[PDB]
């Protein structure tokens, strides 16, 4: 046996030049794709913004064209999904996770257009979903598209070009190269056996796409939270506690995301019409909320900075938390195209802040700043619901640049994952592949 | 398909027993690491204040600098040849082996040997880093508690071993993430999936990092300040720098190995000619650590100085050569202690010089050499160890200049890319492969 190792060891880190070059193209495409998608959502959120101007006097009439603008845009997207690409509804990440096990198809000729224009409308109407959904799936697809179109062959190149698309796709959505890389190797990568996913390949794609995102979205953070205070050792136990809280709520939130998913299915029955109408309903409800209480609706990024600066009351926080648990589920469990990742960043931020707010009053002797707990909590729901702690932590790091909070973050996030396990819940992106797969089976 | 649905639903489950044990492993490796750190200081200090007792007689002080290092070096080379041959050199390849179940983890032996062993090579001011000692000591500490708690399984053997190695790197650089990524990019049996639980490793890394902090709080090993940003029209420069690291990467591996051979003959294998050749290089270091500290030592001290563009282009090219020389001599020779840190220093220095030139060729880019120093710091690590992800995050964690993330990723990747196409190998892996071919032949 030993003699094969010595032949393997000496062959370690070799990635066929063909593959590498292709990842580069994959990356560049996904980047541009992602940037295009980003401009899209803006433009629409804008038209919407300036349509409430045309009707700025009649309060009842404006509440209307807010609802109908979101409703119409939402429907356009739910439809686009049910008609031409069922698999492109919801997140799409579990779908890409499947493709790595070779257990789901990558219908790129279908999904690319469907997901792109599909989300372009659910996000545009101001529903509570993130870009990661669309970009990661669009990412992998863009991945396979160039696999096919260059008739590249192999087990390596199929899983490797697919992964790097997914990474460059997450990278491009958060301006987070490392988060994109760690994402593959912690949530994606067929987690029960080793695969031929070349890390170096992924890297390249993530780079190329990050550079694309930068050619266009330079000079302004998604989240600018400033540089917060440090965290003294005698303060650490507090983050463990916060974690334990995220770790029990983690599962319960997964329960709901799935439950609510079921309970929503009945509404339409499966019927493309009752669906597209129920979509346009939630859709519209969002555009209504995005006007008369923006913190309850929308991606959630806007309220992150505000909440980390302790600029919300404890009331406004508990409100925003509930309103958002509600609009998040409604928007995602319902099957609209778009991620649940970002709205989870917002959820955890808000929760964490409230924790800090209390921590601050119970311990003046710790000289706390609630903001540090908001930052500890930002990737914490992601920790307990997705079981991607390493990924969340580095995502938040890349996005908020408060490295001093690394211990507090790791502790909240780990402590989150620990309790998500011992209270018995599952990787939400994985329990969703498992539903999907049990249904594709228990109908044959 | 039906097994997947049963596997997927079982994903992320790590036996509570293991987790609790990682915690202990971590705490131990932490304390271990901190103790080791105080040790090296204390000795570097005695040495410092021995050149005081003899502060007048220049020829006599050059002497007790050489002899103090020489004596301390020998004590350690010996301690290795006599009781634990495997604890010489880095020890990481040794731990890498144990993950394939292809090398023994003689903890009852190596712990004391590596600890006191390095305590002397580092103390005497040789050019080697704490990672060597801590990572190996780490895994050992790992197995020690596996055995002593008769824990069983394939999971718990590779898990508890990895988390020790991680907590061990973590503790050496105050780098939790770098420690975690380190396992899953350089360690983890890279040809098949293993039962190394990430969540397990994490916990140990944490516990050990908190130990390192209970004692080494307030004071960053490398305080480089917050450097300037890097404009897109500036990125191609870091690609070029990487291509340079990527061709030098292999050549440095050639030497580390070659020089390793060429040094073997010196002592033949003979524990006496070895311990004497050790004490020789040892002493040469303490001599250099006085009359030119930048050529000797761990190298951390000169990082800040070089990133602030406080060396001349001359002093840089000198320090680079003198250091390639002392680094090889110190590591290829078999002394206990890592090559990681001296690679950080090597890359920093190289990068700076690159920046210095970049600055004069392009006043229109408003460059700061410092950014290229930071791009280069993990770059040799990229091309020689093929751990780019790990280097990047190590430098990130140590220098807190996240704005340089693109420049860094680009230099590092571009480094790894050329290390491949110019045909070189993961140095920590070519070393397991030598070791293994000799235990076979």
């Amino acid at each position, epitope marked *: 046996r030993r003699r094969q190792l010595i032949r393997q060891l000496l062959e370690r880190d070799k990635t066929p030049l063909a593959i590498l070059f292709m990842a580069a193209v994959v990356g560049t495409l996904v980047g541009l794709a992602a940037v295009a998608f980003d401009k899209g959502v803006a433009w629409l959120q804008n038209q919407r913004m300036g349509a409430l101007v045309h009707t700025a006097d009649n309060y009842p009439l404006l509440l209307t064209v807010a609802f109908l603008c979101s409703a119409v845009l939402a429907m356009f997207g739910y439809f686009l999904v049910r008609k031409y690409a069922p698999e492109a509804g919801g997140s799409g990440i579990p779908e890409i996770e499947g493709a790595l096990e070779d257990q789901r198809p990558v219908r790129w000729w279908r999904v690319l257009p469907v997901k792109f224009f599909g989300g372009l409308g659910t996000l545009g109407g101001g529903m509570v979903l993130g870009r990661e959904g669309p970009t990661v799936q669009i990412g992998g697809n863009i991945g396979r598209m160039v696999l096919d179109i260059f008739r590249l062959k192999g087990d390596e190149a199929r899983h490797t070009l697919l992964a790097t698309g997914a990474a460059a796709g997450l990278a491009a959505a958060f301006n987070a190269p490392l988060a994109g890389i760690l994402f593959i190797i912690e949530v994606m990568r067929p987690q029960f056996r080793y695969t031929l996913i070349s890390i170096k390949a992924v890297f390249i794609g993530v780079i190329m796409s990050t550079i694309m995102y930068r050619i266009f979205n*330079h*000079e302004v953070a998604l989240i600018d939270v400033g540089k917060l205070s440090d965290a003294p050792l005698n303060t650490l136990w507090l983050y463990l506690i916060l974690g334990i809280i995220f770790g029990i709520f983690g599962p319960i939130f997964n329960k709901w995301v799935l439950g609510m998913q079921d309970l929503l299915h009945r509404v339409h029955g499966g019927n493309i019409t009752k669906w597209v109408l129920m979509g346009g309903a939630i859709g519209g409800l969002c555009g209504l909320l995005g006007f008369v209480a923006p913190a309850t609706s929308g991606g959630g990024f806007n309220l992150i900075p505000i909440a980390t600066a302790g600029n919300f009351s404890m009331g406004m926080l508990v409100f925003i938390f509930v309103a958002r648990v509600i609009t998040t589920l409604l928007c995602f469990s319902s099957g609209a195209p778009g991620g649940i990742f970002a709205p989870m960043l917002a959820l955890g931020t808000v929760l964490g802040t409230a924790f800090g707010m209390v921590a601050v009053e119970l311990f003046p002797q710790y000289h706390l700043e609630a903001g540090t707990f908001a930052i500890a909590g930002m990737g914490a729901l992601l920790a307990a619901s997705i079981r991607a702690p390493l990924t969340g932590i580095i995502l938040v790091l890349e996005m908020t640049d408060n490295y001093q909070l690394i211990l507090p973050m790791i502790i909240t996030g780990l402590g989150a994952t620990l309790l998500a396990q011992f209270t018995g819940g599952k990787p939400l992106y994985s329990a969703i592949l498992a539903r999907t797969l049990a249904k594709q089976e228990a109908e044959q | 398909r039906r097994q997947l649905i049963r596997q997927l639903l079982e994903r992320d489950k790590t036996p509570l027993a293991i987790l609790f044990m990682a915690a202990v492993v971590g705490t131990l490796v932490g304390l271990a690491a901190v103790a080791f750190d105080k040790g090296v200081a204390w000795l570097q200090n005695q040495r410092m204040g021995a050149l005081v007792h003899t502060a007048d007689n220049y020829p006599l002080l050059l002497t007790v600098a050489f002899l103090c290092s020489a004596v301390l070096a020998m004590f350690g080379y010996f301690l290795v040849r006599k009781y634990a041959p495997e604890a010489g050199g880095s020890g990481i390849p040794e731990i890498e082996g144990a993950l394939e179940d292809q090398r023994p983890v003689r903890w009852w032996r190596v712990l004391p040997v590596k600890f006191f062993g390095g305590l002397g090579t580092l103390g005497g001011g040789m050019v080697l880093g704490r990672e060597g000692p801590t990572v190996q000591i780490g895994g050992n500490i790992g197995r020690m508690v596996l055995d002593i708690f008769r824990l069983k399984g394939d999971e718990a053997r590779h898990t508890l071993l990895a988390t020790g190695a991680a907590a061990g790197l973590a503790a050496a650089f105050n780098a939790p993430l770098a420690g975690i990524l380190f396992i899953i990019e350089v360690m983890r049996p890279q040809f098949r999936y293993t039962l190394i639980s990430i969540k397990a490793v994490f916990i140990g890394v944490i516990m050990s990092t908190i130990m390192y902090r209970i004692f080494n709080h307030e004071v960053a090993l490398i305080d480089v300040g917050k450097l*300037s940003d890097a*404009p*897109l*029209n*500036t990125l191609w420069l870091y690609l070029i720098l990487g291509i340079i690291f990527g061709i030098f990467g292999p050549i440095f591996n050639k030497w580390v190995l070659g020089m390793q051979d060429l040094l073997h003959r010196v002592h033949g294998g003979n524990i006496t000619k070895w311990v004497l050749m050790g004490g020789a290089i040892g002493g040469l270091c303490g001599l250099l650590g006085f009359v030119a500290p930048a050529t000797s030592g761990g190298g951390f001290n000169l990082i800040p100085i070089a990133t602030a*563009g406080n060396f001349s282009m001359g002093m840089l090219v000198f320090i680079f050569v003198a250091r390639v020389i002392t680094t090889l001599l110190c590591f290829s020779s078999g002394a206990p202690g890592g090559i990681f840190a001296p690679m950080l220093a090597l890359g920093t220095v190289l990068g700076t010089a690159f920046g210095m030139v970049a*600055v004069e060729l*392009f*006043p*229109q*880019y*408003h460059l*700061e050499a410092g950014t290229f120093a930071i791009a280069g710091m993990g770059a040799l690590l990229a091309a020689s160890i093929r751990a780019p992800l790990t280097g990047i995050i190590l430098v990130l964690e140590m220098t807190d200049n996240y704005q340089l993330i693109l420049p860094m990723i680009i230099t590092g990747l571009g480094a790894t890319l050329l290390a491949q196409f110019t045909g070189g190998k993961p140095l920590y892996s070519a070393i397991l492969a030598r070791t293994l071919a000799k235990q076979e032949a």
Partner: antibody
Amino acid sequence: VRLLESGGGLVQPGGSLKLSCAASGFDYSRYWMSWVRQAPGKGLKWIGEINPVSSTINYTPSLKDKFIISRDNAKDTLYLQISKVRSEDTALYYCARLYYGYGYWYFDVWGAGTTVTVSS
Amino acid sequence: DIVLTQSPAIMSAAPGDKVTMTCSASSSVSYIHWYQQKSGTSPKRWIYDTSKLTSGVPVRFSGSGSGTSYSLTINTMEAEDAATYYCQQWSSHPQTFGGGTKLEILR
């Protein structure tokens, strides 16, 4: 964010003066600072720039110690010293914060000016 | 040092016109900038990297060019656009400014 330059006025030919630029409303380290001047009725001319750690200081092609650009981040203030002032030095002196987009640098934000008049 | 020469030294136009000034450079430049300078006032960064508008600059403004020829147009000029437009390169060192198109209004 404000740049408020000062110390312009009457100087005798062959003399010398120290214009100062007071910076406020932004982290005055972090930024390269610069001086540009407008001769009366005429166009813009770059005098020089200084990086935040005063370790780079470029000038326009001109004579050895003609201009001396310096900064003092302690005081959030840029300085310009002009020597052996001749009449061509009579102008409006602008203080500018430097920045970039793709990376070809530009004069981001400008002060109001002080005027230097060289006259017997 | 690159010499930038701006086409019309002075020019006139009725609001509503499409107005267009020119920056020509002696050697090659890339991503040049523009500062409008309204009267008795300090220059304001207007267009940059050849065609990005600074925040605030009304959208009637646009930039373009490459090589040795750049322009700073203004689809449907307005009366308040009356300024002297200076162009500037820093793709080569040292930076250099153009001479100046003076925009003169016709009521």
